[PDB]
From a paper:
Like its archaeal homologs, Polθ-HLD comprises five subdomains including the two core helicase domains and three additional, closely associated globular domains.
Using a slightly longer construct (residues 1–894), we obtained crystals of the apo protein, which diffracted to 3.55-Å resolution in a different crystal form containing four copies of Polθ-HLD in the asymmetric unit. Slight differences are seen in the ordering and positioning of various loops that are probably a result of local crystal contacts, as well as minor differences in domain orientation with the nucleotide-bound complexes (discussed later). In the apo crystals, 32 additional residues can be seen at the N terminus. These residues form an extended loop and α-helix (only fully ordered in chain A, due to crystal packing), which packs against the rest of the D1 domain and is unique among the structures of SF2 helicases solved to date. Analysis of the asymmetric unit of the apo crystals reveals four forming a tetrameric clover-shaped molecule with D2 symmetry. Each subunit in the potential tetramer contacts all three of its neighbors, with the interface between chains AC and BD in the apo crystals being slightly more extensive (850-Å2 interface area) and hydrophobic than the interface linking chains AD and BC (600-Å2 interface area), as calculated by the program PISA. Finally, a much smaller interface (180 Å2) that is composed entirely of polar contacts connects AB and CD. The interfaces are almost entirely composed of contacts from the inserted regions of domain 4, explaining why the quaternary structure is not generally conserved across the Hel308 family (archaeal Hel308/Hjm proteins were reported to be monomeric). Furthermore, the fact that the D1 and D2 domains are not constrained by symmetry contacts suggests they would be free to move relative to each other as is required for the helicase mechanism.
Author numbering: 35 to 246, 256 to 367, 377 to 564, 575 to 599, 605 to 837, 858 to 892
The structure:
């Protein structure tokens, strides 16, 4: 309570001295024992959890990052360091400081749901011994515990931005003590990366209006940015940057037999150990060298098709070596369990995976289901899979290290590889505390030799403001939403409050000319003309409408909201209730293409389509004539924006897919019927699950109760992909769509019935879906059919009791 963490005395002195000197002391003149983690007054429960696996001492840069400046006093901090250097620890120690000393709540923000889920359990494991409640706000997932009874909320960008807005309407902004942002370089330009700016600017604006002692501390972290100092000034934060890295990493490119360093100085020549009797660029040979040293290798490939092709080739030579240098020495018993977990899945065991996985080889792309990739990542992380051929999708995903990383080509998707993508790939080489080094090899040809060097000698592009206006397009989505949030939320009323806000943006930090100040005024006008905001005339004062407050509470983009609002009023004038199709059309997202739709397949399902669903189609805009003009001819046309008709048919097509999906139609059947892979479907439902929740809230705030009533059941049905009967069962964590079904078909319709269940009977029911651990969960200890059965019944009782998580 008094002091949860305090640094060793005079450690700040020495480090401040060394930093102020022209050159660093050959021997650091401070007790090397002072960077021992136990001397910082850390509570015992956390000190052991850190010492649980490594984490005994701090780095030179970690001590300087805390001690140099007023970081520990409450000052905002923005620091950058290479990956796997212990960037997590700096933030963890700061969160633990403020939460226990100032008794306020912290916010941890991560880019993706998968890394957010990983972080939730990772933060739960460290802080549960000190009574620190850690839950998560991810995608469609909602915390069981109220926000008032939490300490650390782990969120994605969208959910965090929404959570901030909730706290403004309830005036409980005082609860929030600090916000931690991982990967701050995604601030510049992204599909959702811009929301991170709106979030931070909103915090900087509120704390500035109270400036007219500590407030809300912001701890941001990222990769080496050229304009990182520009970001620190924007957030009024102290800056820190280091290149320190516990495992030195070598980036190298390979031409012919020769392998080269960044400087182009040849570092090693290369002679393949084995001969793949295939014109190869020694690709199999490079992987083989790594495996023999009892390690694992990540192989990144441009297309989804190369990964499967390459995993098959690698597996084939592994086959040849076994029946004829040394062999791959894999673990067969543990590999069979992996295949069995794959076998017992809603997707089944992929044919290419069936060949390669037995020989410690696998691939990873967006074509696979989220359940297959969770298995492969876990298998690779354990060492069961030694070779993993992935795409650029994995490079930005979860934490998954390997000894050697190989990039097949600097040309991804017919275009040169982005610099940020390259740095994310080569960044996964080197496990802190296990491997001595992380090696990165970029395989190239003679024509593309100059382009390969460009990547090793490359740096991140400067961070854009993402609210820029390029001449004619004076208005922009990101700005409109940002302006809407501050007016509707009630933190900006007058015209004077508006110009105060313009100062807090990252955009005005970029000038330190004020031509963008007039753009703010344009968004306000846009909001007035479209009934989002009201104006009452020492300047005119504004206020939110019902449509304004509804749009904000729904987390919808104002540009999209206009069309959503019209579509809903039209549906409530004439609505089809005999099926679920018309409801689904309203919650079908069409802001991005989720697949390349085959129109001929579409037209065949159209004739065969029942009358009840054709009525919904006609009622929407689906013309049979346009479907015919799609099959005969591939004319996108799109000459006239009045060709949204294209979007309508794409939307109705998508709505058909979601209909079979919540009707518990197998993913393989849906694939044959429509012509899209299981990866695109799963990506679609999680997109539609989120959108369905938005439309429900939007309908609730407008008073459209009847429409809301129908919609308020589909966020859950889209998430798990179930029918109404299974809605009660899926409340259990361990129960997905398939397990919920076999339990329903056996007599367990509700949670109440599931608490009364006999354990040995559940195991038997499980046996029908086929000490062997054969059942996968999320964050799974590879449950046995016995362990899983006992956990489900115990949990069903816990949910019925509503005791704790």
């Amino acid at each position: 309570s008094g002091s949860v963490l305090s640094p060793p005395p005079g450690l700040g002195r020495c480090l401040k001295a060394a930093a102020a000197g022209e050159c660093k002391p050959t021997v650091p003149d401070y007790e090397r024992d002072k960077l021992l983690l136990a001397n910082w007054g850390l509570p015992k429960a956390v000190l052991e959890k850190y010492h649980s696996f490594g984490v005994k001492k701090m780095f030179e840069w970690q001590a300087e990052c805390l001690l140099l400046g007023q970081v520990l006093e409450g000052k905002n901090l923005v620091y950058s360091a290479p990956t796997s250097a212990g960037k997590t620890l700096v933030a963890e120690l700061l969160i633990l400081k403020r939460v226990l000393e100032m008794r306020k709540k912290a916010l941890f923000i991560l880019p993706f749901v998968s890394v957010a889920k990983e972080k939730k359990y990772y933060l739960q494991s460290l802080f549960q011994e000190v009574g620190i409640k850690v839950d998560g706000y991810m995608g469609s997932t909602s915390p069981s515990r109220h926000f008032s009874s939490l300490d650390i909320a782990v969120c994605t960008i969208e959910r965090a931005n929404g959570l901030i807005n909730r706290l403004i309407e309830e005036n409980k902004m005082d609860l929030l003590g600090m916000v931690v942002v991982d990967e701050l370089h995604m601030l510049g330009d992204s599909h959702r990366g811009y929301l991170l700016e709106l979030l931070l600017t909103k915090i900087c604006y509120i704390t500035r209006k109270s400036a007219s002692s500590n407030a809300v501390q912001i701890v941001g972290m990222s990769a080496t940015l050229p304009n990182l100092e520009l970001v620190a000034s924007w957030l009024n934060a102290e800056l820190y940057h280091t290149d320190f890295r516990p495992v030195p990493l070598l980036e190298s490119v390979k031409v012919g037999n020769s392998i080269y360093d960044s400087s182009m100085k040849l570092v090693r020549e290369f002679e393949p150990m084995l001969q793949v009797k295939g014109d190869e660029d020694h690709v199999v040979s490079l992987c083989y060298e790594t495996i023999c040293d009892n390690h694992s290798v990540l192989l990144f490939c441009p297309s989804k098709k190369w990964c499967e092709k390459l995993a098959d080739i690698i597996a084939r030579e592994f086959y040849n070596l076994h029946h004829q240098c040394p062999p791959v020495i894999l673990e067969q018993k543990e590999l069979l369990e992996v295949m069995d977990q794959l076998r017992r899945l809603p997707s089944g065991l992929d044919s290419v995976l069936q060949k390669t996985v037995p020989w410690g080889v696998a691939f990873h792309h967006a074509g696979l289901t989220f359940e297959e990739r969770d298995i492969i990542e876990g298998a690779f992380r354990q060492g069961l899979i030694r070779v993993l051929a992935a795409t650029s999708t994995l490079s930005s995903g979860v934490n998954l290290p390997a000894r050697r990383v190989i990039i097949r080509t600097p040309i991804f998707g017919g275009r040169p590889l982005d610099i940020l993508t390259y740095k994310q790939m080569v960044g996964r080489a080197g496990r802190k505390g296990v491997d001595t080094v992380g090696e990165s090899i970029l395989i190239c040809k003679n024509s593309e030799k100059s382009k390969g060097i460009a990547l090793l000698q490359g740096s991140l592009k400067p961070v854009r403001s993402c609210l820029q206006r390029r001449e004619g397009e004076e208005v922009t989505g990101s700005m409109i939403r940002a302006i809407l949030e501050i007016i509707v939320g009630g933190v900006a009323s007058t015209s004077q409050d508006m110009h105060t806000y313009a100062a807090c943006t990252f955009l005005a930090a970029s000038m330190k000319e004020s031509v963008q100040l007039g753009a703010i005024e344009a968004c306000v006008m846009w909001l007035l003309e479209n009934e989002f905001i009201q104006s009452t005339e020492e300047g005119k004062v504004y206020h939110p409408t019902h449509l304004g407050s509804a749009t904000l509470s729904s987390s919808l983009s104002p540009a999209d909201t206009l069309d959503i609002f019209a579509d809903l009023q039209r549906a409530m004038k004439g609505f089809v209730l005999e099926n679920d199709l018309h409801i689904l059309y309203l919650v079908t997202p069409m802001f991005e293409d989720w697949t390349t739709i085959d129109w001929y397949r579409f037209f065949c399902l159209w004739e065969k389509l029942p009358t009840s669903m054709k009525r919904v189609a006609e009622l929407v805009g689906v013309e049979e004539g346009f479907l015919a003009r799609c099959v005969k001819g591939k004319v996108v046309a799109r000459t006239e924006r009045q060709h949204r008709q294209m979007a309508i048919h794409k939307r109705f097509f998508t709505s058909l897919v979601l209909l079979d999906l919540i009707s518990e139609v197998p993913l393989r059947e849906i694939n044959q019927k429509y012509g899209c892979n299981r990866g695109q479907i799963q990506s679609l439902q999680q997109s539609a699950a989120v959108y369905a929740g938005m439309i429900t809230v939007f309908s609730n705030r407008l008073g459209w109760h009847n429409m809301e009533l129908l919609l308020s059941q589909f966020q859950k049905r889209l998430t798990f992909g179930i029918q109404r009967e299974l809605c009660d069962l899926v409340r259990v964590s361990l129960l997905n769509a398939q397990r919920a079904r076999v339990l329903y078909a056996s007599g367990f319709h509700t949670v109440a019935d599931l608490a009364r269940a006999n354990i040995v009977e559940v195991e038997v029911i499980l046996k029908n879906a086929v000490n062997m651990r054969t059942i996968w969960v999320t964050g799974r200890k590879g449950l046995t059919e016995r362990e899983a059965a006992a956990l489900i019944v115990e949990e069903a009782r816990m949910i019925l009791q509503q005791d704790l998580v």
